[PDB]
Enzyme design. Structure first.
Site, PDB file in Angstrom:
ATOM      1  N   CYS B 510      -1.453  -1.466  -2.706  1.00  0.00           N
ATOM      2  CA  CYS B 510      -2.464  -0.531  -2.156  1.00  0.00           C
ATOM      3  C   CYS B 510      -3.820  -1.667  -2.018  1.00  0.00           C
ATOM      4  CB  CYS B 510      -2.931   0.521  -3.129  1.00  0.00           C
ATOM      5  SG  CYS B 510      -3.865   1.874  -2.145  1.00  0.00           S
ATOM      6  N   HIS B 595       2.226   3.505  -3.478  1.00  0.00           N
ATOM      7  CA  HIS B 595       2.474   3.519  -4.824  1.00  0.00           C
ATOM      8  C   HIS B 595       3.726   3.792  -5.567  1.00  0.00           C
ATOM      9  CE1 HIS B 595      -1.927   3.513  -6.174  1.00  0.00           C
ATOM     10  NE2 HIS B 595      -1.879   3.951  -4.610  1.00  0.00           N
ATOM     11  N   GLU B 597       4.554   3.723  -8.290  1.00  0.00           N
ATOM     12  CA  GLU B 597       4.507   4.196  -9.495  1.00  0.00           C
ATOM     13  C   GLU B 597       4.374   5.755  -9.585  1.00  0.00           C
ATOM     14  OE1 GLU B 597       0.505   3.322  -8.970  1.00  0.00           O
ATOM     15  OE2 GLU B 597       1.636   2.237  -7.596  1.00  0.00           O
TER      16      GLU B 597
END
Lengths: 616, 617
Positions: B510, B595, B597
C-alpha cells in the site's frame, strides 16, 4: 430474595439488574466508585473462592479514549465502577411478576439534531470524509431527549420490565443505578468476552425481520441468498481482526455467519476469537470501542466523529463491563456495548443516543428514516406502542386513501340523500335483459327525479304510462336471434322506433339497436372487463366504464336511416368502435353509465334521456 | 362464570365455539366470545331453527351457522356437490372472556401436521389456472374468478386440545383478522383467522366489507411513505372495481335503495396491511333470505357471480366443502331487532374426527394474471395456518435446517480462508517489517509468520542491522504518498532509496508501494472514487487473483514495463483499461497496492509468498 426485594423496595442505594442469554437475572449492589483512569480500576489481587464470582461492574464513557491519545469531546462523563459487594440470582418468571409500574411517559421527546440539521451533518460526512478517503465507514449519532414524570429508580424498573417482556433476544437487558445517574437498555451486541485466556468479539452483520405469518425456512434462505450487500461487513471484520491482533498476539479467527434467532427478528453474527494474557484493564483500554459503533479505521473514525458532531457522546458506544473471576481464580470478563440505552438523571432528564452507520453507497434521508425506526425498541418503553391512533389515522395516510376515489364515480360514495332538471316528475320503464346492473341504473334514474319501474322482456305493458323506455343490459351475443330473450329485444326496439316512443338503449340493447339501424357488430380481439376509458361523447370528453365483449363498428360519424332519419354516431375514430348513438327519438350507449368506473353517470343518463325526450 | 371456558379448556364441552371478533370497538382489552349448545343439521336455510322474535332487554345471540359452498343449489347455481351439510349450533350458553387471560390458560399441544400436501400439485394447478385465464376470462366469461386447491395433512391423536392449541397460536400471530375462531362440533372442527367479513346487520343496516389490496411491510418496518407509495401505485385498478361493482349489484338486491361505499380504509396487521372498503344499505329482508341472496361474496367467487359459479364448477375438480362459505352468528339486539355478524370461510382448517385436516386456498385471477406466480402465491397464503400447526419455535431448530446451514456457508465462499482457520523454501528465514502505523501490519506479520518466516517489526526512525534479515517489508500506513512534508513519509522515502541502493531484497505494500512508484518515477493520482474494502479480480503477472483494495491514491501508467537507472527492468502489473498499477516486480524487490492480508483477498498467504520469493534473488 433479600437483594431483589430490597432492590425493589428502595433500601439499596446503588444497584444493577442485568439479564443475560447464557433463564435467570443477576442482581448487584455495592459502592459506587469513580476511578481516575482504567489503570486505577479497583481490582483486588487474584484469588480463588472456589465459586465463580464478580468483582466489579464498570461503565466506560466514550471520553475515555483520551487514554489512547484519540480526540474526543468532554461530556464531563467519568469512569464508573460499582464494586459487587452483593450478588444474587433471580428467576425471570417471578422477577417480572413484581413490577412497580408508573407513568413511564416522556415529556418533550425531541432530538439533539432534528431531521433538517442532521441530514446536513450526515451529508457532509458521506461526501467530505468517506468520499474523500478519510475512511470506509463511520458511525454518527444524535441524542433523543425527554423529561420524566415524578421520576426515581422505581420508574427505571418499570421500563426494564417492559424491555424484558418484548425484546426477548438482546445480549444484555439491564437497569444500572449509580447515585448521580441511571442506565436502562436492551443492547444487542457484546463488546468483549474473556473466559480462560480466550477473548471474544461478536459483531452483528445483518437483521431479518420476519413477515406477517411466520419465519419460514425459505424466507430466511431468500434473505441469505441475496449477497448484494457485502459493504460494511468486510471493512468491519478487517477492523475487528486488527483490534484482536493487538490483543491476541497470535491473531484472530472468525467463525461466521451464525444465526441468532428471536421472536420477531433474526440476526446474522460473526464471532472473532483469540488467546490473550493481557490484564483486563489493558484489554478494555486497547479495545476502546467496537468498529461497529465508531468506524474503520478506528483512529480516523474518531477524528471524523470529532470533526462533525457538535456534542459529546456520554456513554453511547461505550462499554458496560462485568469483571470477575472463575472458581479457579482465572480472570473473567463479560461486557456489552452501550447502545439502545437510556442514560437518566435524578433531575429526571432521559437521553438516548442513536447512530447510523454510513458507507459511500448510503444516502442521508434513507438512513435518517432509520433514526426513528431503530429507536422503536426503547421508544415503545417511554409510552407503549398501542396507546395512540394507528398509522392508518395519520392525516397523510388518510389523504392518500382518499386520493384513490378521485378517478371514480362519486354517486356510490354519497349517502341516500344524494338526490338532485325537467326530468323531475317524469316516469320511466326499464326493460331488464337479466343483468344485475339494472337495479343500479334504476337507482340513478331515480336520483335524477324519475319514478322508475322495471319489467322483464316478456311482460305486457302500457307504454302510454311512461315518458321514456330504457332498454337494458344483459348477457349474450347480440347477433344471436336464436336466443328468444334477444329476439324479444329486437321486437321491443323495432316497436319503439316504429311508434317513435322516446327511448334509451344500453350495452346489449345498444348493440341490438345498432344491428337494427344496419351498423355491423363484431367481437373485440380483447374483451373490455371493467376498464375506464376517456371517450368523446358528442363534443364533451367523458370517462366511462366498459364491460363489453362485442361492439358495433363503423367508419361513419353520421347516417340517414330509411324509416328513422338522422342518427349521430359517437365512435373511436382509430378503431371505428361505436360508443353512443343519438337519433331523433332516442339515445344509446355501449358503456355502463352506472358503473363505479364512470364519472358523472347520473348526468350522462340525464343528458341521454333529455335528448330522447326533446322532440316535443 | 368462566364456567364455560373452563369447560372448554378441560375437554368437557362436546360442542363449543370460541370466536374472537373484531366487532367490539377497539376498546383496549380484546374479548373472546365463548358458546356451547346443540348441533343440528337443517335441510335448508328456510329451515334454520329461529324463534319468533322477542326482546329480552340485553343483546343476545341465538344461532351459529356454517354454510357450505354447496348451499348454492338454493339459488339455482351449479356447484360440485359434496354434500357438506348446513350446521346450526344453538347458542344455549354464551360467555365472554378476555383474550389476554384466555391465551395464558390454553395449553400448548404438539399439533404437527403429517403427510402434508396439496390435493392438486403445482404443475396440475398451473394448468387449470392457465385454462381459466385463457379460455374463460380471456374469452369474456367474466372479469375475475377464484379458483381453489386444498392443503391436506394429518394430526396424530386428534382431539379439541389440539384445535385449541392452534387457535392460541393464531391469536398470537394473526391479530387484525376479522374473526379468529375455533368451532367444534362432534363431527368436525373448524379453526381459522379469516380476514374478511361476509355480511353484518344491525338495526336494519346491512354491511359488506371487501378487501382490495395487500401491502407487505418491507424488512425493516412500515412507513407513512411506503404505505403512501403503495396507495399511490394504482397501476392495476384490476379486480378492485369489478369487485366493487359486483358487490353493489349484490347489495341492490337486498337493499332496494342501493348501497353506499365508504373507504378505502387501512387494515393493519403486525407485518402487513390491507386496503378495505365498506358497502352499506338499509334492508328489511329476513336473515334467512339475506344469507341465501348473498351466497358468496364476489371476492371468493368471481364477477359476475353466476358465471363465476359456472366457471368454478367447470374447472375445479372437486367440491369446496366450507371454503368460501359463511360462518354466521345470528341474534337479537336488546330491543328485539335482528342482528347478524358473519365471516367468509377462507384461511381456515376443517378437521374431521379422525384428525384429517383440509385447508382451501384460492387464487384470484384476472386477464393479466400469471399461472406460475399464482401457484407459488398459494404456498405463501397457507403459511399462516401451516405455521399455526407447525410453529418454527416448536420444531427443535430454525436455522439448524441443513438448507439454512448451506446458505450461511455460501457467504464465506468469496473471501479469505486463513482467518477462518485455527493456528517452503521460504521456510526458516527472517523478515523485518517496517510499520508505517497501520494496524494491518500485525495481520501481515501473522501471515508471513505462517509461511515460516520469523517476523520482527520495527518503526520508521528506528535503527537496525539489515544483515540480520532475508527480506525487508515496507508496510502500510495512512497519508498521501506525495507528501514529503510529513516526516514519517520522508523517512519511508529514505528507507526505500536505501533498500534500492544496497539491493536488499524487499517487498513494499500500500503506502510503501505508492512511495516506491514515486521513487521509480511512475505518477501518482487520487482516484475519482476511493476503494474502501472492495474485492477486485486483477491480473497479477499472468495468474488471475481476487484481492482486497483500500486505496484512495494510485500510481498510473500506460507502460507494462520500464528500465530505470538504479536497478534495471521493472515489470508493471496494471489494469489495461485504466492504467492503474496493482503491483511492481523489480530485480531486488516486489510490491503491491492491495492488501494481501485482508479478509477480502483470496489466497493471501500464497500471494505474499510469491512476492517474497521473487524479491529474493
Amino acid at each position: 430474595r433479600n437483594l431483589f426485594d430490597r432492590v425493589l423496595h428502595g433500601q439499596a442505594p446503588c444497584f444493577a439488574l442485568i439479564a443475560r442469554s447464557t433463564a435467570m437475572i443477576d442482581v448487584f449492589a455495592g459502592a459506587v466508585s469513580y476511578p481516575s483512569s482504567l489503570a486505577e480500576l479497583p481490582l483486588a489481587a487474584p484469588t480463588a473462592t472456589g465459586a465463580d464470582r464478580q468483582e466489579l461492574l464498570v461503565m466506560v464513557p466514550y471520553r475515555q479514549l483520551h487514554e489512547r491519545g484519540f480526540k474526543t469531546h468532554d461530556d464531563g462523563a467519568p469512569l464508573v465502577a460499582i464494586t459487587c459487594d452483593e450478588h444474587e440470582t433471580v428467576s425471570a418468571q417471578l422477577a417480572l411478576a413484581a413490577i412497580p409500574d408508573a407513568d413511564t411517559a416522556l415529556g418533550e421527546r425531541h432530538f439533539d439534531i432534528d431531521d433538517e440539521a442532521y441530514a446536513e451533518i450526515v451529508e457532509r460526512v458521506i461526501t467530505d470524509e468517506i468520499g474523500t478517503g478519510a475512511g470506509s465507514n463511520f458511525v454518527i449519532k444524535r441524542t433523543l431527549e425527554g423529561d420524566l414524570d415524578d421520576y426515581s429508580p422505581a420508574k427505571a424498573l418499570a421500563v426494564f420490565k417492559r424491555l424484558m417482556r418484548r425484546e426477548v433476544g438482546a445480549y444484555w437487558i439491564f437497569v444500572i443505578h449509580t447515585g448521580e445517574r441511571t442506565f436502562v437498555g436492551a443492547t444487542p451486541e457484546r463488546h468483549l468476552t474473556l473466559h480462560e485466556g480466550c477473548a471474544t468479539m461478536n459483531p452483528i452483520s445483518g437483521t431479518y425481520r420476519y413477515p406477517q405469518s411466520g419465519p419460514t425456512i425459505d424466507g430466511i434462505n431468500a434473505f441469505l441468498g441475496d449477497r448484494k450487500e457485502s459493504d460494511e461487513l468486510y471493512m468491519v471484520l478487517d477492523e475487528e481482526l486488527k483490534m484482536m491482533a493487538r490483543i491476541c498476539p497470535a491473531g484472530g479467527q472468525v467463525t461466521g455467519p451464525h444465526l441468532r434467532e428471536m421472536a420477531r427478528l433474526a440476526h446474522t453474527e460473526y464471532f472473532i476469537v483469540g488467546h490473550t494474557e493481557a490484564d483486563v484493564r489493558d484489554l478494555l483500554r486497547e479495545t476502546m470501542f467496537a468498529p461497529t459503533v465508531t468506524g474503520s479505521p478506528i483512529e480516523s473514525a474518531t477524528r471524523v466523529i470529532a470533526r462533525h458532531e457538535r456534542a459529546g457522546r456520554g456513554y453511547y458506544s461505550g462499554i458496560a463491563a462485568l469483571i470477575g473471576r472463575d472458581a479457579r481464580g482465572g480472570r473473567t470478563l463479560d461486557s456489552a456495548i452501550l447502545i439502545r440505552t437510556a442514560e437518566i438523571d435524578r433531575a429526571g432528564h432521559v437521553r438516548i443516543g442513536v447512530g447510523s452507520t454510513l458507507v459511500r453507497h448510503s444516502d442521508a434521508v434513507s438512513e435518517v428514516m432509520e433514526t426513528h425506526a431503530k429507536v422503536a425498541a426503547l421508544s415503545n418503553a417511554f409510552d407503549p406502542p398501542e396507546a395512540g391512533p394507528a398509522l392508518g389515522q395519520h392525516p397523510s395516510v388518510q389523504a392518500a386513501l382518499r386520493e384513490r376515489n378521485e378517478g371514480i364515480a362519486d354517486f356510490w360514495f354519497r349517502p341516500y340523500g344524494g338526490r338532485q332538471a325537467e326530468l323531475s316528475g317524469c316516469r320511466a320503464l326499464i326493460v331488464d335483459a337479466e343483468d344485475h346492473f339494472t337495479a343500479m341504473i334504476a337507482q340513478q334514474l331515480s336520483s335524477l327525479g324519475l319514478a322508475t319501474e322495471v319489467c322483464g322482456v316478456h311482460d305486457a305493458v302500457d307504454l302510454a304510462r311512461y315518458d321514456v323506455v330504457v332498454m337494458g343490459p344483459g348477457p349474450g351475443d347480440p347477433s344471436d336471434a336464436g336466443d328468444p330473450r334477444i329476439a324479444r329485444l329486437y321486437a321491443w326496439l323495432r316497436h319503439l322506433i316504429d311508434e317513435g316512443k322516446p327511448f334509451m338503449a344500453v350495452c346489449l340493447s345498444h348493440q341490438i339497436l345498432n344491428a337494427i339501424l344496419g351498423i355491423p357488430l363484431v367481437r373485440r380481439e380483447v374483451p373490455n372487463q371493467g376498464i375506464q376509458v376517456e371517450i368523446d361523447l358528442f363534443g364533451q370528453r367523458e370517462r366511462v366504464g366498459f364491460y363489453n365483449t362485442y361492439v358495433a363498428q363503423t367508419v361513419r360519424d353520421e347516417m340517414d336511416v330509411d324509416g328513422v332519419g338522422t342518427v349521430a354516431i359517437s365512435r373511436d375514430p382509430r378503431t371505428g368502435e361505436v360508443h353512443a348513438l343519438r337519433g331523433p327519438t332516442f339515445s344509446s350507449m355501449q358503456f355502463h353509465a352506472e358503473s363505479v368506473l364512470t364519472v358523472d353517470g347520473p348526468r350522462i343518463l340525464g343528458e341521454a334521456i333529455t335528448h330522447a325526450i326533446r322532440r316535443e
